[PDB]
C-alpha cells in the first residue's frame, strides 16, 4: 500500500484517476515512471504515475 501525494486525472484508457491522500493497494512497480495499482476509494485498477505516489 501507497498513498497519493497529488490529484491525477487519467490521460489514457489504461490509467486511473485519484486524489491527494488516496490509498493505493496491491501496487506493483512497472518501470521508473509507472506502477500498477488499485485506487481503494474508487475501486479502479490500472496504471498510475509512480512519481505521484509514496510508499506506506
Amino acid at each position: 500500500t501507497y498513498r497519493a501525494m497529488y490529484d491525477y486525472s487519467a490521460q489514457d484508457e489504461d490509467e486511473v484517476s485519484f486524489r491527494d491522500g488516496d490509498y493505493i493497494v496491491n501496487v506493483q512497480p512497472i518501470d521508473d515512471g509507472w506502477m500498477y495499482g488499485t485506487v481503494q476509494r474508487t475501486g479502479r485498477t490500472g496504471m498510475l504515475p509512480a512519481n505521484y505516489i509514496e510508499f506506506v
Binding site: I30, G33, W34, P49
Partner: peptide, 11 residues
C-alpha cells in the same frame, strides 16, 4: 503536480 514520464507498452 509534476510532469509524468513516458508510458511503457508492457512488456
Amino acid at each position: 503536480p509534476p510532469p509524468t514520464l513516458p508510458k511503457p507498452k508492457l512488456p
